[model samples]
Target: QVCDVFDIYAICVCCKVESKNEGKKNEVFNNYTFRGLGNKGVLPWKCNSLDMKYFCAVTTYVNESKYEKLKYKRCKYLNKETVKLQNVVVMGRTTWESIPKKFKPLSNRINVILSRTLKKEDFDEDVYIINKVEDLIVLLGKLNYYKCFIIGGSVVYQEFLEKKLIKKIYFTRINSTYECDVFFPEINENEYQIISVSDVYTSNNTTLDFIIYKKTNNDDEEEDDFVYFNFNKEKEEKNKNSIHPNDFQIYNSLKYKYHPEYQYLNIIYDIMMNGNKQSDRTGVGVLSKFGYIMKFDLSQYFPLLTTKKLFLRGIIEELLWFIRGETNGNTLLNKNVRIWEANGTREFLDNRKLFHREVNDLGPIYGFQWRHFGAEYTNMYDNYENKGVDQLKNIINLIKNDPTSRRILLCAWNVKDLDQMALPPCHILCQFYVFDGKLSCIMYQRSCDLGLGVPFNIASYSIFTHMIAQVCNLQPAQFIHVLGNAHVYNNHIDSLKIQLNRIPYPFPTLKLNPDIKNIEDFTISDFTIQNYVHHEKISMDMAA
Candidate 1:
């Protein structure tokens, strides 16, 4: 009855039945269809009774059909039916082949279908398992269907689990184990929420758990859990010294080829002033159109030049300080970074407390909210113990164990607490994606001070991804940086151009201490860098 109402069209299962057993397979198939189509209230009992029948039929069909014509027909028909029913069924060959001959007719009725194939060379155990999983996702995405049911083999289920694609799962715990070579991955009870279990069935001594799991979203809002430093002045000074190698080459290439009379800085100024100036009421049109192209690519050809020297050190340090989640300028002063000196001088000893006060302190913005936003009434910590650890670990586990949750979020902008912060968060929020258990972080910066902020934003978030990956037991994916407002200060055109002319050296690799277990426990001392080679330093002036 459930299958009838939902227009399931086919009920897929796994089995080891051989091609010769057409008679037994037919019997099993008829019984399943009869039970499935026979009674409305008896649907659950029929589902249980007919489960083995489906698997038996599929196996017999695959072996008897020689794995070519039937497989193709099954895939094409299933794909067509997927479009028709607006649902797709993704199952392994073994599962498909297990269905009885009579039930094989259902394949003619469904819309979309796909199967996984394994490569022979890298036939090692882990590779084999991983390949099976990877192929499933590639098949699903390649088919271009919105929703699909993953009919199982243990490996297929594991693959979907790693991909974070499966929205819902149905499992029946049958009692008898007919000598099998494959097994299911152990289910972690803490990660999944069981929706329901069916009444125990004595027939064949099988009991099923009709479980439904919806991934949980981490809602951790602990703003003041850690101390913060306001390191702005030291940051600015540091940015002033670090020359971007890519900037020099771009400048030289443009000059050598074009041989323009005006200097690179002059060209940038002319372009910024006259080239494609439009009212970006949304505030992002300029950068998305010009800035992204200029800095990211051309800087490899000609470094972006502002009329004035750029504050390279300050930008880098400010970014580092934000990642450190410090709101006080004293720590920055100690490090000789001066981006925050102007703001620190204005606030003095009152700076740290100022982060919690109603008045803004004019200090660094992202740091305050990231490390110390005041606790919300509905704190995520209240719901789960070991708030910070669970928040970080559970999210990693969710990505590995359940990815489609779409709630992998981190917030740095708190509207209610903005007035209390040193400055409002510039890089306001971020989300992460878990594909094949690899983590990719995407950040949303509401406002980007291009000369002083964009570079650091990229580097900081990249480092953030590395740190999070280390803690979550995953490898780094890509870092997607989304900007609302990215721009160059009217003054730093010359330095940017000069820097752009230089050759871009390799980006340094970051190493983290292996012993660091908690996100809150990490410190600057725990990080180490190697092979960091860059061009000579450049100087720059700062603007408010």
Candidate 2:
């Protein structure tokens, strides 16, 4: 499946199924022919609604040991990503006081400090005074932020933990050679489990690694958040049975209760039944469709297609590989997956002469772009302490701390390192949103090979949004996929038409471990998709 990390950095990883697409031409097409983009316009089951709230926090520690804390990294990791995304930085009043006047209000980010005695006008022009952290949410909603990053001076961090506002954390464990009074908040292992760790990196002879922790939730949805939209009024009224006026019926069923394939099929029909002839870098050609956007509701059913068989193992292994920041393909090969074999062949790399082009080095591809985006990277074994932009870590922090900051972005197009990659990123960007205490991800793919690629992208991002929502103590809302030059290659035309004939079935349901917090700690065993029945697999060839 090429869609979201299953969508995220794993889109092009492994959809190398049986390539018999052109052969399907002999079997069909007289009965069905797509001349143009059919119903491919914006179809919706939802919109931006208020009345939802979530608390997110980010904590980084360095200069600590069994004794003390403080002497932290100047938070360069925080500074770079904050400015890059132009995020909202929330901190305690004391933390605000600690900032020198010259850099107060944090240039390039929304500076909000918690201070009961201070009024909004009490701070400088760019500074926002908050009576409390919860009050920031109401103010943040009007500003339209994708998320926020909470930087702290002990008090704020402790308050967030006591109030259960922090959903994710990006912790930097610096070797503690120096002594201080401040210590990290006492963590309950029952609430968090270490999922991933970076290779140790040293500065001033002090070693540190960026460790990530996710808030553990082992319970089912005990709190029900039902939304009612008085569309005649355009405001949300919380209700259980009111389904809004315009939302009366977009599908055949009373609600979206039919086949999961329809979730994909309806969109494919829009793209193919409604397209034009256009060319691509592959030169195989396409019945090009104008870029369109689509969103799927995750609350109904897991969006994994029930039309054709998709290998859960393949998508699972690759996403973990991306999350683990593995650049070498041998690990994937060891998992018995041939997905990257197309690009990592010794002969393939030898032709381009990549730096260390031996033994399945894909030369800093998706995992690198996601985790170590712009370092002068050589190989997977090299130390990556404070190396490149950790967008995965950055965005997660944003989702929890500043879910309203309008720029919760994750970028994979690394301009400086493109020459080293075996293939440039296709699903280039993911912008996550938090609304009504539910998480949604809007993925932008610069290039999309419609036949098999889009489906992978769908499954990937849906699962991805779910994972993020779960960790942040929110529900997965939807995935908005925006494509540029969406196309079906010359050979895929007939096969795609054949796909239209298959019957859609009830969607499958996915189960994830409740205790799992860290994205990396999730395993294939932790995931379960139930009652998924599909048509026979029809694998198509890809352009690599």
Candidate 3:
């Protein structure tokens, strides 16, 4: 059982008795242990049994500097615990002297100090001094003793590794800063294979890492050259697993206070940073996340990000176009907005041919789906209709009359006709609420293009809510956004990083011409954003 790290096994310890009286076997004591060490040792080797985790020296990084003596919490705890096991801890004589007087002997654990001539300085019977690695190897092989860890001063680690005696190592990294008297030794990549690099372990506002390396050689005849070790990267691995559809753990959950713009930035950064790598439909491999939620407070200022300049005009025009129940991309094309151009192009249309579409016509994308969702698939010849479930009409009808209805939601994802659309809906579902003289909305987006889609979405929804509230004589409330798969493209990683670094300006005021009472009557000239300031434009290619 001790062949595995952190496993428990049985060990036997016999009481020490007098010399050369060869009649009876010593009384056996019971305990937990390592598997391979047995009862074949000579007299000195058969003294006791012990369990060990490891008493080793690891080079730690603090503030970009390498330090060998940094006291890690795990190291400190293991030192005191080793005493109870009666295990031997190897250290340099220099380290032995430098230890504070109170904890110098390092008590409990058997202390073995390294020095020339194999002589103990204090003459303490409990501590032994050995100069060569061969001395300790003899004690473990012939004497039936446990091996020692190079746990003490920097020099002890240097000499032990200089002899190529170490086969297993715990390479720890700490996040802060410290001065190093001696840094870690250089390792030859050809000689060792890294086994594991643990996930981020945070404590006291800093990070700690545990990486393991195993020596590589042709010694193994059965398992071949490849060796595998499990690494605990739960936060990231948990995302790729099927159990959590919208697995979002890397992001900082929205506090929903002060500037909620951080909520948007933090989530985008998290998705780009640790999200799983996958080949998506766009042919542009992405780091995508499954699930996410952003809490936007309409009670506070509207949650708009000023990190980069957002095209409020495109957002406003496109939404109004959707409200008109039009599936033709020609309307948006006429406005010089080419977001839907890639999908509505002749080349994309000729590929699958689920439905025949004229050049620049996106059949039943958002507006048609919003008004005629679940409508039967006929070609794009039937320009505009109220044939299917009119989600927008129903939603507006509810808020004006039965504001408290629980079923006050709508969907644009026409599943039965998914194959027929030019490009399926990405921002697919929504629920609206009306209470206390205000209207709030929560939306579920099945997929999003983080850099291009999200900013436009934030503005569009907030505008939609304001328009609906004004038509119903209610104030604009919160717009809660829930995302199923939020991802950034490989090319957008650096671009997204650029966005996160910019300082966000306060959100501008969204004003609706109060005279425009009907939802159907609103136009591009009816809305204005006051005091919207931002950074230069960062354009990204869209994947269809």
Candidate 4:
């Protein structure tokens, strides 16, 4: 757990504003001056010398020429005169050590490291140690720093950004990709405005562009400088002698203030920035990242991508069909849910070397495998009731009889029947966990098409978990997704960027009828997504 960015309740830290509406909140809404928007852009293996220098250019190059004449007048702060001015570069120990031998001190800037393990004697004389994020307030206010910059190691980035302390971001969009695990969090474009952009540059067969963003104001009127100083002053003092009122840990609970949808957006941003660009089996190229996971708490709300509108009816219909152990695509098509239309076409099936099989016959897919695993190969029209192992029924039995059993799982990938499938299962397997009257699901998908497939997968599995929980008389908890080869098709990149720029609303609540005890009994009308406020739909093609 991390420290609270601001340790509130000391002298009742609050903001001052002239407007009546603004005064209603504890703090002024327009705290843009101190707001920093950290860059979410990728840091490639290499960049041009000029591009690398921009960090120092922005952080260190303060315009003191105009203020030089007014320095003496402005120096009478608290009736004391001082001229020492320098920016503070805050980073985690990982970033601090990543610096080369000669640049260890980061030259001409105050180096502040956040490490509970590190000691002051371990660093150079210029460096200072702060145990918590709130300490930054004390360290900066006690000294006259011109500006503060949070740099490197994703954890430090999360700490500063989550606290909403960053004011400006020197976002460098490096047009290159690589594999990575750690990534910068998603930026809320609604709160910031682009103030400047640099010309695109290309070097060493790579391209990049530098952009600056500043936080927007709540009121259109010009900011009153005195109010800004007063708000910031009280905040700094509040942190100077902060002490937790009680021992009960609340850091984890405090994070609920941040929308969980950023987990989806962060991976998208990371994939675009760091994923490998390569050709795939479909002939369409992709920017792909392997081995990623996202967990959504069903107890909070249904996990839907609010950044863009989704087709709820199609998702519901497809899931219902899958749960009923129906593999014939014609059933879904007849219901006017054309999600499988492209794959179920005769032309597409023939390309899969499946000419003998009928069109719209997606053989032994999720449904067939779930209810009839190890069943003999047969036409879709054949009735196979009581013919093969019923995996879903057995799983439900285990969930009811022995909730602690580790073997409770459902598998869709039957190696023996892959040859007959029109398209292999992207979401391959799922396992359910029960604890304290709550049910959680963890699903594994071998291939995740982020733009089109992932959102559907998220909702499908989440709804499936809730349905199972309902049947077991357990409350829904979480839906954990594990992905292999999570990718974004080359064609979808532009539309995805537009989607990422929008803010996500609270996840809509998922309502299921309590009377439905069996999974197969659920109908399309049984599921409803309430208060699903979302952005306009951004279109993208499916890579079928």
TM-score per prediction, in order, is 0.40, 0.51, 0.52, 0.56
* Number of backbone-clashing residue pairs for each candidate, in the order shown: 83, 38, 7, 5
Off by over 4 Å in 4: 1-257, 541-544
Better of 1 and 2 by lDDT: 2
Q: Pick the candidate with the highest TM-score.
A: 4
Better of 1 and 2 by TM-score: 2
Model 2, residue 409: displacement in angstroms?
1.0
| lDDT (tens digit, per residue) of candidate 3 on 329-393 | 87788998777888888888877484466876677778877888777745555744658888888
* Candidate 2: segments with Cα more than 4 A from true spot: 1-260, 270-274, 351-356, 539-544
> What lDDT score belongs to each candidate, Candidate 1 first?
0.44, 0.58, 0.59, 0.69
- For model 4, what is the alpha-carbon lDDT of residue 199? 40
Q: Which stretches of candidate 1 lie over 4 Å from their true place?
A: 1-339, 347-368, 371-401, 542-544
Q: Over all chains combined, what TM-score does candidate 3 have?
A: 0.52
- Order of candidate numbers by TM-score, starting with the best: 4, 3, 2, 1
Q: After superposition, how far is residue 198 of candidate 4 from its true place, in Å?
A: 31
